[PDB]
Amino acid sequence: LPRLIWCDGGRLDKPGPGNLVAGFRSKYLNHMMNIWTPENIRSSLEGIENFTWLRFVDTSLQEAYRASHTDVFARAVDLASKQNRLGHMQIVYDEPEDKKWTPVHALFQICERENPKAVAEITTEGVLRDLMNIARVKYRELGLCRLEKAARPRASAPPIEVVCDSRSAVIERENIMFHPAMRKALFGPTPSEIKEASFGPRPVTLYPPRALLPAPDHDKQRFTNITVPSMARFVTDSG
Amino acid sequence: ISEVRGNTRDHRTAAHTHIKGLGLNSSGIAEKQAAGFVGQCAAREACGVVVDLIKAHKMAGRGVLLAGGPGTGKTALALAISQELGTKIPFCPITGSEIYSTEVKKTEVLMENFRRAIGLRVRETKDVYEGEVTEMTPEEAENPLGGYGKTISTLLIGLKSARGQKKLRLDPSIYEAIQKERVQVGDVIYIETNTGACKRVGRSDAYATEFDLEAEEYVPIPKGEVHKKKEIVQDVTLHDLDVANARPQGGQDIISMMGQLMKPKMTEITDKLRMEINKVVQKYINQGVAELIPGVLFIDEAHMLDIECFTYLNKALESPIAPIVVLASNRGIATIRGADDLKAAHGIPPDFLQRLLIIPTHPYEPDEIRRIVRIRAQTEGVQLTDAAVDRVAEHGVRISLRYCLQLLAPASILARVNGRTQVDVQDIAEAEELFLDARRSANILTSTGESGGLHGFIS
Amino acid sequence: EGEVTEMTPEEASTLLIGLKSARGQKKLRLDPSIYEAIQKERVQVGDVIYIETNTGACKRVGRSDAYATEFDLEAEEYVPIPKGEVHKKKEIVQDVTLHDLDVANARPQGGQDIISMMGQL
Amino acid sequence: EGEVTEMTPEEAENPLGGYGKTISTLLIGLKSARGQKKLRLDPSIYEAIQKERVQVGDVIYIETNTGACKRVGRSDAYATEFDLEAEEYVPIPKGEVHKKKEIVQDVTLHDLDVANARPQGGQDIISMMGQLMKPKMTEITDKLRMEINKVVQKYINQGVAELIPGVLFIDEAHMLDIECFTYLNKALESPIAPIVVL
Amino acid sequence: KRPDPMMIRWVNNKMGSVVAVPEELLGTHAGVVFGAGP
Amino acid sequence: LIAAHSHIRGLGVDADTLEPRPSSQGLVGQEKARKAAAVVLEMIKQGKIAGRAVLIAGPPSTGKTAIAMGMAQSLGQDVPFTTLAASEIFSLEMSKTEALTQAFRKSIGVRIKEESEIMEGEVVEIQIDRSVTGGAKQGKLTIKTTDMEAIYDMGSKMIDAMTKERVMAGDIISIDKSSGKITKLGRSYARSRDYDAMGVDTKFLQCPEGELQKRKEVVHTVSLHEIDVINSRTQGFLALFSGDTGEIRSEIRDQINTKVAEWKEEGKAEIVPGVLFIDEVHMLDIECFSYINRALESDLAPIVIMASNRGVSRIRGTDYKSPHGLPLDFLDRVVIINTHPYTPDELRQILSIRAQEEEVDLTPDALALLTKIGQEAGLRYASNLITTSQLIAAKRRAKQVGVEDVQRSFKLFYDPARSVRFVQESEKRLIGNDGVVDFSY
Amino acid sequence: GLNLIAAHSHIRGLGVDADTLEPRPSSQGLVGQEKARKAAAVVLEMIKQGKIAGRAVLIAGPPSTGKTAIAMGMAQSLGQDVPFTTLAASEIFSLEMSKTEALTQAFRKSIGVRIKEESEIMEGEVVEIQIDRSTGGAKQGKLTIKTTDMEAIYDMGSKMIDAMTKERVMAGDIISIDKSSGKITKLGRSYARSRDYDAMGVDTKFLQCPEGELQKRKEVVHTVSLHEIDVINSRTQGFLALFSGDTGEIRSEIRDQINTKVAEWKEEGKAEIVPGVLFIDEVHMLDIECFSYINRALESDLAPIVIMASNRGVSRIRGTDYKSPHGLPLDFLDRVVIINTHPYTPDELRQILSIRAQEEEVDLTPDALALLTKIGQEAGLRYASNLITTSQLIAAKRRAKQVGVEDVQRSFKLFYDPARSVRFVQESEKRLIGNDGVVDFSY
Ligand SMILES: Nc1ncnc2c1ncn2[C@@H]1O[C@H](COP(=O)(O)OP(=O)(O)O)[C@@H](O)[C@H]1O
Ligand SMILES: Nc1ncnc2c1ncn2[C@@H]1O[C@H](COP(=O)(O)OP(=O)(O)O)[C@@H](O)[C@H]1O
Ligand SMILES: Nc1ncnc2c1ncn2[C@@H]1O[C@H](COP(=O)(O)OP(=O)(O)O)[C@@H](O)[C@H]1O
């Protein structure tokens, strides 16, 4: 691509000389004339006005404003730093005199304040716990986590890249295609962060509390299509 | 915090609010007027056997058809069955219209509702310690390990509930939970004996004045015993087990967490999962720790199902763990919705119709209509003159039961805006003239819509 | 718009940024947040940058070619120093539509929604 | 290839990114039967090693084409019964630590199309997340197909590849429709279309 | 021999259980639960 | 619970001569169809023949499902027996062709053999090291028999399992080193008293004996479809159970077919061909049949058993009628088995079997009347009256179902023929095919 | 190469005099169709001048009368310098997007933006690299590089050292550096250093040293379609959707912004607009909703010229139950001019078969050519052209050097033409599956 398109305002969202619209439109549509900003929400927070419910959904005006502006990956990382306390209340606030107590600011969080799962975690014989785990128990019992792969892709490629002879394009490739905050979320804290979190005089939180990359479904193949020969093949592939 | 409303908490009223049951003797014979029913004595006796079939838990996947004209009480009988069974028995009502999901094939929607209609009751013991943390105190070990600065043999926690105080001599490993949950003195926690860990509910509101500002909510002290051991009864449908297995909820990873933040579309769950669920459910039933509760799937306007739905119900009804299915239809001889050249009775395919116990509901005599008018009036709280009861029942005979019942609320208002608490003929005669029935409205369409060029109906 | 002459912290976080053009210099007190915007652009002393000080947008235009011989090869885009005034004030009449407001309020847009690059859902 | 003899990360103190620190490189020592090297890996290759759960004393494989890492096993120097987990104890790799392997591969043009439409081979974030999302067919553009013709033409001109055009057998071809047949009128004009048997 | 500065050890046997804490972690926030904070 | 085919417990044929007994294993009559089905069981059990399509045809009832369910009961657990209602093939997640491909491949098993090592012993000591504020974990397990004791290193996955399972000293545990599953079995001595919240008391066990390790052969059977799903993905194997698979690409299945042949010759796997039972197959459309024509031709095709109630009937997606509702170039590939309507002596036997299965004690007069009702109203209706009459008899506290209870059941519940008369007698008060109705008295 | 022989491979252009637009009776691979080729030559003049926007031309004629041939002739005579978009009407029926979106995208692919950009580029053979790692790496380093005319040392900045170590540059490598961005591309390896390359197999190729200045201002010309600018602006890596194809229905306010932006670049002279052409083969497969869209999409200043082909008579318009010429509504045909293609005479059939035989590798005897020409008159030009390949393969199997009449006669006997195959189904009617689904399997 020519740098006219890829760098110098042929991209509508990126502000600069020769894209005078984008900086204005970024500020006004995301902040000034934006319904989710706390100053706008605070005008609508009452009566039958459109944010009336916000009082009861267990989220701040700041949290409503973050959830409207961050993408579903960033929100999923923020969701890692949170606790199922309404599910713990189901364990504790239990007797008739507890009157199924719920924080009034969390009143509408009905389906998490009451559901069977949390109780099944806590009972001494896990009948409803095991019933909710059948699918993954069956999967592992069949050994499908350990059986060799019977197929793989015959070809594999890295993503296509824009080639543009500007330094900004190279910087942007690193910012997006090798995105630091997403990578840090997936792979978690660095070794000095673990030291600095562990030896301090007071506790401290970490950007992700843990590595957020999932466990691989296959115990031996993991996240790669590399395969390794074995003695079973070696014995049997000569008659 | 929230301002309680003190004055009134009375019920609303809907088309079937008067129906309280099937109104049957201990012999099962129908009483001619009971539990809000008038007449239908044969259909009520048949539905009484259906209630006994369901309540006996012997049988799976029997079909029932309520057959009869519109307004003949078929949904009244279904709602009466649900009330005779009581809320412990699952009752899943749908129309046949509700099966046409955009997210999944309509046979999955039908099978979801089919397994919503099957309940499971599981009895377990819950066993936890609870309170605000009054104290936390290590015990040094008598044989400390070499090279380590401290060795702890016990970790004492004081727990206080509203009803007592106890010193828990815990295993030292609970340090892990205390650090990770950040348990302080004055925090409300529980410890569960099946793990030995703890979880933090919050800070006790006994401490809500520690600071002018702190960023946490405060929670009441537990109003139970400090040690809660009791049996708990959990009711789940087998559909709840399908979803709990096909869409696991608790996942800690990025993909699970992005998942629970996005639109949670339903999915065409496999027979392999449902069969594996059935086989493990049956293990626990044979162990006696769970009991199956077969309920009712009620399909209203069952003539809205198509031939693909019915041919699936053949398979579904043959499975060993299945509800009783009740269908209702009023469509005479009609085309099957998916087979534009097959006409059959009830709009039900003849192949499928052979499976069903069929219950006919007949029309009402004028005196039955008049009795229903009085039952409906005393349910809507309307007070009538006997001449007004007769005039309303006349519309019930000449026009429709539904139409005459629907005039009672307009006439009640028209009476009180003349200062009268009792509705009389003058009010009925105005309600019936403000509020037309279908047929008189259709006569206006025929008369004024004789031409369409201007001021005429669109046709 | 100018060559960066200074990037000095002035708060416990607020900078002073010095900007230069062929026609003079100016210093700007920076809000902590536009400073982070300037810091996410890989701006350093000797770079040429553009700032919309009202909207809070900024862009690294390049490195000033007075530094072009820092090395004989570097992977860098050397540009001349701006020849005009370092500060420019312009009246712009900006149009949007109520649908642009719909779109902007319904979902995170543009550089907010980086995960959108994956397609599918 | 080698037994991992030492493994040591080195760190960047990012001031204002908000994600905290990042790791700037990994130094890793690989030992084979014939020799030894110490590699200063790029962060994206260390992320491949992190995904592969490598530890000191493991034998590993690092394909520099992809930057992928495979853990072959524990080194046979640690071969002991007394681990609860069924480890692969494997001997030290023979030959040099650094190798070049020649492999002859059979692929179709469709395999190339698909590989480049939904990429999974890199250690970038798009490739990484592409391995986690549900597999999904997509309406691959003619731009990608003409680009892959040029890629394959270069493999042919380099002499590393030969073309093997084959056949598509459409059984039950009466079950096609007028839009399909109209599309074949374009598709069969393509200068590398197969032979089609109906 | 000296234990790992960052790892707390739990052990259990016929006599019951103990936890043992590195002296490098006493005087940190991790020591507080053992009665040995800053 | 009791269901429609619960009494069917086999095919009711002599395993030597394949001769159907007139009553056996819950099946009555249909002897030609039951003998033909017994021959198809041999084709299935031998497995050498691929892709024979058998159609069971007949009018409604007459046991087409009953015979197919008898075959399922005769094959037992190891062989796949996929049942489809043909209406399940229409899907929004995938094409009809893909839905058929998945159901065909669900019907082929792959019996993998694995060798595994299990530990079993008394835990003498357990030690775990945990990082502060981090994931790093290590540990050691000291475990014992009457004849061995050893100390095993533990990884993070074991330490998670050990604490999830709350492994404590004195517990008897077994560890499958291949899967990594830990299970407790009991305790060598009482749970120690000093600590609170230590959980429920276990079974007692004496200590295990002999060597700590032992090897164990374990056998797993998975479908070709299950292998398809696992291999089309890096991640998301939950699609095995959720559906949610998408349309799996054909070059994946080519590879799996090759590798499964390789696994068979290598002796890693035994392929186990089963059956796809498609029920009421006339619900498939012309595109489905055109696909099935050639799906049958693979050497990995299952034997396909089909049922149809249909006469000469319109093919779906098609202008024109055909026998069984099936197209002729499809029927060219199909052998047909015909079921026939029952004799009264057969109805009496079937009703007796249903009554026994439902635990209902009919009087001989009630059985005679139910048999007569069975002739006039159908076998399904007369079987419904058995359950109904039992309930009515119980409400009057009778020991047995009398003619009184069958007559009251017949009075309360209409049969299809009598319901059709009721519909004809009330055509004005029921809604017509043109939507007109009268609500007035 | 990769490119095999296909149906149209012989077409190299339109075969028309550039001065007068008079078509030659045969040239550039096109025989006859002179009135139609002259009309197509006037359309090329309209396309190349760019002035007129949104003309729609229909090529109407019977099957196998060179409607696609003329369309290939136009594409070949415009060359790579102009956007030419080849749409089969069947492609508009996407599941990814609506029909009108797919038609918008097709129109937007057919307008180019042409942009000229310089870079300094450095190209030469590497004489030496040294790098100092202290031990974190890339502290400093020096590159020595040469051409046949020039040699220089460069002191390297640390990010160039990262580029050099990433691309494993070593002595003897011939490299180019795009110094405006610092990507380095290894153009090859010098032959003069062949023995340094101990890790390179014998299949490795080697270049000569580069020539002239080590540094040159290379000028690149880019053409990017409006559709590419649209798709780029659709999401964070929207350009990937130009390949995977999962563009959604791209919002029209994005396109309106881009239309304004490109008109700005045109007036500033930063870019030029290059109107191309959209070709819609089998336009009769579009429906009434497509045609009513196309009506007004042609009215834009950013409309390409559109060219369409139809075989159809008075035929049913799709999405309606009435019939119209070419299968197209008169509502649309009012805004269209029609070019009509005729059937060929025998000498034109002879010439086309000859050209097809010379484009294929086929030595054809005069009597075989005469026989194939008669078959062409009786069975159609496509069938006779398919027999050329067949007869060559038969001749080759009997080891013959030329295709003789004997080989054409085997081909004619083995493979039926459409008229003989129609007769075959009429005579075989009871054994084939009829439109009522009936068939008899018996002898
Ligand atoms: N036997 C009855 N006794 C009392 N109310 C009845 C009776 N039958 C019908 N109704 C009432 O009259 C109305 C019509 O009955 P409904 O069950 O809605 O008819 P259907 O379901 O057959 O259309 C409802 O409001 C219902 O509550
Ligand atoms: N020959 C038979 N022996 C025993 N039970 C039978 C026989 N035929 C039918 N039945 C029973 O009667 C019912 C109807 O037969 P079914 O197999 O459902 O007929 P269809 O051929 O329509 O599927 C089933 O409950 C079945 O168990
Ligand atoms: N005038 C011509 N000159 C050269 N080749 C031609 C001519 N007309 C047709 N052909 C060739 O004959 C074949 C059939 O004509 P084609 O244009 O494909 O058919 P249609 O007009 O139906 O699209 C093609 O291979 C084409 O290249």
Q: In Å, how far is G21's CA from the nearest CA of chain A?
A: 37
Q: Taking each helix axis from N to C terminus, what angle separates B386-398 and B366-380, rounded to the nearest 10 degrees?
A: 120
3-state SS of F394-440 is HHCCCCCECHHHHHHHHHHCECHHHHHHHHHCCCCCCCCCCCCCCCC
Strand partners, G315: G324
> Which amino acid does the sequence have at B297?
L
Q: Which two tokens stand for residue D89?
A: 């104890």
**Helices and strands in chain B, H and E counts:** 15, 19
Q: Which one, of G288, G342, G296, G306, lies nearest residue G57 by Cα?
A: G306
Q: In Å, how far is A143's CA from the nearest CA of chain C?
A: 31
CA atoms of F119 and D82, how far apart (whole Å): 11
Strands (E) in G46-91, as ranges, are 56-60, 84-88
Probe target for ligand 3 pocket from G28, G38, G65, G388, with the most ligand atoms within 8 Å of CB: G65
Binary contact (D72, A192; C-beta < 8 A): no
Q: Under a CB-based contact definition with an 8 Å cutoff, are residues B359 and B81 in contact? A: no
Q: Decide if C120 is inside a domain.
A: no
CA atoms of F50 and F297, how far apart (whole Å): 8
Element (H, E) at G184: strand G183-189
Nearest ligand 1 atom to the CA of B72 is 22
Q: Which one, of F188, F123, F200, F174, lies nearest residue E17 by Cα?
A: F123
Q: Give the C-alpha distances (Å, rounded to integers) separating B252 from A29, A211, B249, B258.
A: 34, 10, 9, 10
CA atoms of F285 and F297, how far apart (whole Å): 19
CB of residue G381 inside a 6 A radius of ligand 3: yes
Q: Which one, of F125, E31, E21, F154, lies nearest residue B146 by Cα?
A: E21
Q: Which two tokens stand for residue F188?
A: 């060598």
CA atoms of F173 and F125, how far apart (whole Å): 12
Q: Which one, of B352, B368, B350, B292, lies nearest residue B316 by Cα?
A: B352
For residue C85, how far is the Cα from the chain centroid? Answer: 17
Bridge-based pairing of strands D89-90 and G305-310 is: unpaired
> In degrees rounded to 5, what are phi and psi of residue A74?
-60, -40
Q: Which two tokens stand for residue F202?
A: 């276990």
**Chains with 3 or more CB pairs under 8 A to chain C:** A, D, G
Q: Which one, of F326, F304, F301, lies nearest residue F40 by Cα?
A: F304
Q: Which residue of F has its CA nearest to G439?
A: F328
Q: Taking each helix axis from N to C terminus, what angle separates D109-117 and D142-157, rounded to the nearest 10 degrees?
A: 120
Q: Could you tell me the distance, in angstroms and rounded to a whole number, from the CA of residue B331 to the centre of ligand 2?
A: 29
Q: Could you tell me the distance, in angstroms and rounded to a whole number, from the CA of residue B353 to the centre of ligand 1?
A: 24
Q: Which ligand is nearest to the CA of G69?
A: 3
Question: Tokens 């059939």 — which residue?
Answer: G349
CA atoms of F234 and F246, how far apart (whole Å): 14
CB of residue F32 inside a 6 A radius of ligand 2: no
CA atoms of E6 and F329, how far apart (whole Å): 75
CA atoms of D181 and G345, how far apart (whole Å): 28
Q: Taking each helix axis from N to C terminus, what angle separates G366-379 and G405-414, rounded to the nearest 10 degrees?
A: 30
Q: Which residues of G are annotated as a binding site for ADP?
A: 7-8, 10, 31, 64-69, 296, 335, 344, 382
Q: Which one, of F11, F66, F62, F61, lies nearest residue F40 by Cα?
A: F11
Q: Which ligand is nearest to the CA of B13?
A: 1
Q: Which residues of A1-40 are buried (b: 16+ CB within 10 A; e: fewer)?
A: bbbbbbbbbbbbebbbeebbbbbbbbbbbbeeebbbbeeb
Bridge-based pairing of strands G305-310 and G277-281 is: parallel
Q: Which two tokens stand for residue B451?
A: 């031409």
Q: Which two tokens stand for residue B127?
A: 């066993």
Q: Collapsing DSSP states into helix, strand and coil, what is residue B357?
A: strand
Residues of A with CB below 8 A from G178's CB?
A: 165
Residues of B with CB below 8 A from A120's CB?
A: 124, 234
Q: Which one, of G78, G231, G76, G244, lies nearest residue D143 by Cα?
A: G244
Q: Please give the interface size between C and G, counted as residue pairs whose CB atoms are below 8 Å apart.
A: 61
Residues of E with CB below 8 A from B148's CB?
A: 3, 9, 20-23
Q: Which one, of F375, F389, F289, lies nearest residue F333 by Cα?
A: F289
Q: Which one, of G232, G244, C96, C42, lies nearest residue A13 by Cα?
A: G232
| CA-atom Rg of chain B in angstroms | 31
CA atoms of D95 and D92, how far apart (whole Å): 10
Q: What is the number of other CB atoms lying within 10 angstroms of the CB of residue G387?
A: 28
Strands (E) in F40-92, as ranges, are 53-57, 81-85
DSSP letters spanning B132-156: EEEEEEEEE-SSPPTT-SEEEEEEE
Residue F382 belongs to domain with CATH number:
1.10.8.60
CA atoms of A219 and A226, how far apart (whole Å): 14
Residues of G with CB below 8 A from F329's CB?
A: 433, 439
Q: Least CB-CB distance to G156: which of C73, C77, C110?
A: C73
CA atoms of D18 and C41, how far apart (whole Å): 14
Q: Under a CB-based contact definition with an 8 Å cutoff, are residues G283 and G58 in contact? A: yes
CA atoms of G304 and A112, how far apart (whole Å): 57
Q: Computed from CA positions of residues B99, B104, B107, B110, in that sequence, does the dihedral angle turn out positive or negative?
A: negative
Q: Which one, of A133, A140, E8, D54, lies nearest residue F137 by Cα?
A: E8
Q: Least CB-CB distance to D112: which of A155, A185, A214?
A: A155
CA atoms of A170 and A155, how far apart (whole Å): 27
Q: Is D84 left (phi over 0), alpha (psi -120 to 50) or beta?
A: alpha
Strands (E) in D21-155, as ranges, are 22-31, 36-41, 58-63, 68-75, 89-90
Q: Decide if C117 is inside a domain.
A: no
Half-sphere exposure of F301 (CA within 13 A, CB side): 18
CA atoms of G39 and C28, how far apart (whole Å): 66
Binary contact (C121, D133; C-beta < 8 A): yes
Q: Which one, of G176, G174, G137, lies nearest residue G159 by Cα?
A: G137
Q: Which residue of G has its CA nearest to D165?
A: G4
CA atoms of F376 and A150, how far apart (whole Å): 58
CB of residue B42 inside a 6 A radius of ligand 1: no
Q: Which one, of G167, G161, G159, G212, lies nearest residue G187 by Cα?
A: G167
Nearest ligand 3 atom to the CA of G37 is 1
Q: Under a CB-based contact definition with an 8 Å cutoff, are residues G143 and G154 in contact? A: yes
DSSP letters spanning G19-38: TT-PBPSEETTEES-HHHHH
Chains C and F touch (3+ CB pairs under 8 A): no
CB of residue B76 inside a 6 A radius of ligand 1: yes
With a CB-CB cutoff of 8 Å, which residues 143-172 of chain F face chain E?
A: 168-170
Q: Collapsing DSSP states into helix, strand and coil, what is residue F332?
A: coil
Residues of G with CB below 8 A from C76's CB?
A: 157, 159, 182
Half-sphere exposure of D110 (CA within 13 A, CB side): 12
Query: Determination method here?
Result: cryo-EM
CA atoms of F272 and F258, how far apart (whole Å): 16
**Dihedral, CA of residue B315, residue B318, residue B324 and residue B329, to nearest 10:** 40
Q: What is the number of other CB atoms lying within 10 angstroms of the CB of residue G173?
A: 23
Supply the range of the domain harboring residue F348: 344-423
DSSP letters spanning F8-36: --S--B-TTT-PBPSEETTEES-HHHHHH
CB of residue G354 inside a 6 A radius of ligand 3: no
Question: Tokens 């077919």 — which residue?
Answer: F257
Resolution (A): 2.7
Q: Taking each helix axis from N to C terminus, what angle separates B41-56 and B74-85, rounded to the nearest 10 degrees?
A: 40
CB of residue G310 inside a 6 A radius of ligand 3: no
Q: Under a CB-based contact definition with an 8 Å cutoff, are residues B178 and B136 in contact? A: yes
Binary contact (F132, E30; C-beta < 8 A): yes
| CA-atom Rg of chain C in angstroms | 18
CA atoms of F269 and F113, how far apart (whole Å): 7
Bridge-based pairing of strands F303-308 and F53-57 is: parallel
Residues in chain G: 443
CA atoms of D139 and B226, how far apart (whole Å): 63
Q: Under a CB-based contact definition with an 8 Å cutoff, are residues E30 and F130 in contact? A: no
CA atoms of F344 and F125, how far apart (whole Å): 74
Probe target for ligand 3 pocket from G4, G8, G341, with the most ligand atoms within 8 Å of CB: G8
Binary contact (D136, C120; C-beta < 8 A): yes
> In degrees rounded to 5, what are phi and psi of residue G363?
-85, 115
DSSP letters spanning D114-128: HHHHS--SSSSHHHH
Residue D58 belongs to domain with CATH number:
2.40.50.360
Binary contact (F328, G437; C-beta < 8 A): yes
> In degrees rounded to 5, what are phi and psi of residue F96?
-55, -45
For residue F177, how far is the Cα from the chain centroid? Answer: 32
Q: Decide if C98 is inside a domain.
A: no
Q: Decide if C103 is inside a domain.
A: no
Q: Which one, of D36, D14, D33, lies nearest residue D23 by Cα?
A: D14
CA atoms of F44 and F46, how far apart (whole Å): 5
Residues of D with CB below 8 A from C39's CB?
A: 15-16
Supply the range of the domain harboring residue C62: 1-93
Q: Could you tell me the distance, in angstroms and rounded to a whole number, from the CA of residue G64 to the centre of ligand 3?
A: 5
Q: Which residues of B315-351 are buried (b: 16+ CB within 10 A; e: fewer)?
A: bbbbbebbbbbbbbbbbbbbebbbbeeeebbbbbbeb
CB of residue F62 inside a 6 A radius of ligand 2: yes
> In degrees rounded to 5, what are phi and psi of residue F69?
-70, -35
CA atoms of B93 and B102, how far apart (whole Å): 20
Q: Taking each helix axis from N to C terminus, what angle separates G252-268 and C98-106, rounded to the nearest 10 degrees?
A: 120
Q: What is the number of other CB atoms lying within 10 angstroms of the CB of residue F50?
A: 16
Residues in chain E: 38
Q: Taking each helix axis from N to C terminus, what angle separates A180-187 and D43-51, rounded to the nearest 10 degrees?
A: 30
Q: Which two tokens stand for residue D131?
A: 């391995």
SS3 content of chain D, % helix, strand, coil (to 5): 30, 25, 45
CA atoms of D122 and D134, how far apart (whole Å): 18
Q: Does A194 lie at the interface with D, CB-CB under 8 angstroms?
A: no
Strand partners, G114: G223, G272
Q: In Å, how far is A175's CA from the nearest CA of chain G?
A: 11
Max distance between CA atoms of chain G, in angstroms, equals 91
Q: Which one, of F47, F49, F42, F109, lies nearest residue F270 by Cα?
A: F109
Q: Under a CB-based contact definition with an 8 Å cutoff, are residues C17 and C1 in contact? A: no
Strand partners, F87: none
Q: Which one, of G438, B313, D174, B336, lies nearest residue F312 by Cα?
A: G438
Q: Which one, of G371, B354, B252, lies nearest residue A81 by Cα?
A: B252
Q: What is the number of other CB atoms lying within 10 angstroms of the CB of residue G196?
A: 14
CA atoms of F418 and A127, how far apart (whole Å): 48
Number of separate domains in chain C: 1
Q: In the 8-state DSSP scheme, what is residue F186?
A: E
Question: Tokens 């009703």 — which residue?
Answer: F351
Spell out the residues 6+ positions from residue G262 whose beta carbon is closer than 8 angstroms to its own: G113, G226, G229, G271, G273
Q: In the 8-state DSSP scheme, what is residue G131?
A: E
Q: In the 8-state DSSP scheme, what is residue F281?
A: G
Q: Collapsing DSSP states into helix, strand and coil, what is residue G374?
A: helix
**Helices and strands in chain F, H and E counts:** 14, 16
Q: Under a CB-based contact definition with an 8 Å cutoff, are residues G259 and G113 in contact? A: no
Binary contact (E7, F138; C-beta < 8 A): yes
Question: Tokens 């649908």 — which residue?
Answer: C99
Q: Which one, of G360, G311, G372, lies nearest residue G6 by Cα?
A: G360
Q: Does E16 lie at the interface with A, CB-CB under 8 angstroms?
A: no
CA atoms of F107 and B376, how far apart (whole Å): 58
Q: Under a CB-based contact definition with an 8 Å cutoff, are residues F317 and F276 in contact? A: no
What's the distance, Cα to Cα, between the start and end of chain C in Å? 40
Q: Computed from CA positions of residues A110, A115, A118, A122, in that sequence, does the dihedral angle turn out positive or negative?
A: positive
Q: Which two tokens stand for residue B54?
A: 């369901």
Name the closest-CA residue to atom 23, ligand 2. Answer: F65
CA atoms of A201 and B401, how far apart (whole Å): 80
Q: Under a CB-based contact definition with an 8 Å cutoff, are residues G215 and G121 in contact? A: yes
Q: Under a CB-based contact definition with an 8 Å cutoff, are residues F321 and F348 in contact? A: no
Question: Tokens 């041919």 — which residue?
Answer: B311
Residues of E with CB below 8 A from B149's CB?
A: 21-23, 25-26, 36
Q: Under a CB-based contact definition with an 8 Å cutoff, are residues B256 and F236 in contact? A: no
Q: Give the C-alpha distances (Å, rounded to integers) separating G374 from A163, B209, G342, G390, G420.
A: 56, 107, 18, 17, 15
Residues of A with CB below 8 A from F134's CB?
A: 189, 194, 197-198
CA atoms of F358 and F404, how far apart (whole Å): 19
CA atoms of F424 and F413, how far apart (whole Å): 17
CB of residue G13 inside a 6 A radius of ligand 3: no
